[PDB]
Amino acid sequence: LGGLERFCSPGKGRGLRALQPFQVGDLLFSCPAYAYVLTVNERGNHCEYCFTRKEGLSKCGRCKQAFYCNVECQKEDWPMHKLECSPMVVFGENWNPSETVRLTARILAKQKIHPERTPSEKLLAVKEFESHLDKLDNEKKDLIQSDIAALHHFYSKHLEFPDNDSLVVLFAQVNCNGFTIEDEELSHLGSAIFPDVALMNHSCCPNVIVTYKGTLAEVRAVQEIKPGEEVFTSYIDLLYPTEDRNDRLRDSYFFTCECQECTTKDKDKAKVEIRKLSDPPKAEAIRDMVRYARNVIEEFRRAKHYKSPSELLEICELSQEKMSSVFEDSNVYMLHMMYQAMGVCLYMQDWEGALQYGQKIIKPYSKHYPLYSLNVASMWLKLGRLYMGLEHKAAGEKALKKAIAIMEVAHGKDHPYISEIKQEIESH
Numbered sequence: 001l002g003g004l005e006r007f008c009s010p011g012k013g014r015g016l017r018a019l020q021p022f023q024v025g026d027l028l029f030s031c032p033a034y035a036y037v038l039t040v041n042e043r044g045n046h047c048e049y050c051f052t053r054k055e056g057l058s059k060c061g062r063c064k065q066a067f068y069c070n071v072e073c074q075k076e077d078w079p080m081h082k083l084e085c086s087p088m089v090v091f092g093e094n095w096n097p098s099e100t101v102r103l104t105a106r107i108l109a110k111q112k113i114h115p116e117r118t119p120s121e122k123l124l125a126v127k128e129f130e131s132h133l134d135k136l137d138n139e140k141k142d143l144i145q146s147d148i149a150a151l152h153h154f155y156s157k158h159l160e161f162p163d164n165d166s167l168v169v170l171f172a173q174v175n176c177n178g179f180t181i182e183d184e185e186l187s188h189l190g191s192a193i194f195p196d197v198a199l200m201n202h203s204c205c206p207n208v209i210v211t212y213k214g215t216l217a218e219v220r221a222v223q224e225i226k227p228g229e230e231v232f233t234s235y236i237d238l239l240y241p242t243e244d245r246n247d248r249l250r251d252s253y254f255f256t257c258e259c260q261e262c263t264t265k266d267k268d269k270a271k272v273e274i275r276k277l278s279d280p281p282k283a284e285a286i287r288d289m290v291r292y293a294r295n296v297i298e299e300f301r302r303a304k305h306y307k308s309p310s311e312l313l314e315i316c317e318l319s320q321e322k323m324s325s326v327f328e329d330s331n332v333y334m335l336h337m338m339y340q341a342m343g344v345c346l347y348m349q350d351w352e353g354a355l356q357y358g359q360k361i362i363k364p365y366s367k368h369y370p371l372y373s374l375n376v377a378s379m380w381l382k383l384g385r386l387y388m389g390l391e392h393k394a395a396g397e398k399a400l401k402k403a404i405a406i407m408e409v410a411h412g413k414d415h416p417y418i419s420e421i422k423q424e425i426e427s428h
């Protein structure tokens with residue numbers, strides 16, 4: 001694809017570089033999804049085939065668990081829908097495959113249907129994906145085996161499975177190159193595989209941002225890219241300090257980042273901000289809170305699957321109180337709990353609580369992320385839609401206009417999401 005090229009990136013394997021300049025907001029390229037799945041919770045909200053968010057969604061009369069825009073989207077999805085239609089109804093409540101198993105089954109399907117290079121593989125092919133097979137611990141290798149067992153159990157009707165456990169190779173490849181599709185509010189819509197998009201290496205200070213216009217991945221410049229510069233995306237959440245960022249990257253992607261931010265650690269001091277207070281906190285007292293903060297984060301990750309919403313908020317308020325003694329309110333570990341608490345109030349349809357948390361987050365949040373960040377665009381959007389809901393038309397408009405500003409860069413001026421937000425301002 002024009003104005004870019006695949007190249008050998010010293011110490012980063014294969015990569016994508018520019019052959020022409022790209023300005024802030026310019027679309028480098030699009031990539032139609034090679035394989036994709038609409039997440040189970042978004043059924044009836046989005047079209048299974050084109051991911052269009054609409055209300056007049058017609059049901060699959062054969063499974064009553066697949067929705068479409070019309071009969072053509074339904075017919076166009078049947079080669080992929082075939083995999084789950086009858087099994088969902090025949091397996092009944094016993095039908096529980098994870099999204100990774102759902103996705104991998106559609107990759108195997110695509111490889112049988114269309115074995116030749118797809119328009120999504122102009123620079124990187126699915127077969128050429130990096131696996132990191134050789135660095136997997138037994139715990140990880142066992143987690144892939146669960147997924148393989150699950151593949152065989154639910155998708156054996158139409159699929160012929162490959163040469164021993166070269167399914168381990170494929171499952172390690174989808175873990176390494178697999179994409180999750182999120183909406184305007186960064187809510188999970190599904191999983192997909194974008195091969196050319198997967199060629200891009202990581203930077204904690206990227207020059208590009210991946211957005212989705214249905215099942216189509218779009219790459220837009222968030223910094224100026226000049227000929228010969230490598231195009232880098234972020235694989236992870238850029239709020240956390242160097243250690244946390246690299247702890248996630250090493251775990252999920254088996255590499256350590258050495259970008260300007262991870263080298264310099266410049267933004268680290270501000271990220272884990274400490275209170276100025278009479279008799280400043282001791283060097284060890286700081287390290288003790290970081291360990292607590294990082295453990296309460298994981299404890300919360302578990303607690304959501306098995307605790308009441310009023311219990312979840314209690315975890316948030318209690319942990320914020322312990323942390324507040326050492327940590328300032330701008331600290332990323334404090335801002336996470338506030339983000340968690342806002343999420344709960346939103347679930348409980350507590351629009352005041354959600355707004356009080358948003359307002360408390362946004363200013364310090366904006367500061368901690370790059371200039372064009374999907375996290376802060378989404379946060380400004382949540383805040384705007386909350387204000388607008390609570391009939392605060394002035395503040396709601398400021399917030400929605402702030403979101404539109406970041407969004408016109410990453411998503412593009414003509415994005416369906418921008419047109420939706422503009423209508424929210426125009427009516428109320």
Ligand SMILES: C[S@@+](CC[C@H](N)C(=O)[O-])C[C@H]1O[C@@H](n2cnc3c(N)ncnc32)[C@H](O)[C@@H]1O
Pocket residue numbers: 011012013014015128129130176177198199200201202203252253254255256257258
């Ligand atoms: C989605 S693939 C990117 C394309 C990959 N470089 C290739 O040749 O197939 C992700 C993998 O690329 C490598 N990678 C990406 N960004 C990197 C970086 N900044 N430093 C080192 N390795 C990186 C890691 O091995 C990582 O798991």
Ligand SMILES: [Zn+2]
Pocket residue numbers: 047048049050051052068069070073
């Ligand atoms: Zn459709």
Ligand SMILES: [Zn+2]
Pocket residue numbers: 060061062063064065066081084085086
């Ligand atoms: Zn069906």
Ligand SMILES: [Zn+2]
Pocket residue numbers: 203204205257258259260261262263
């Ligand atoms: Zn980095």
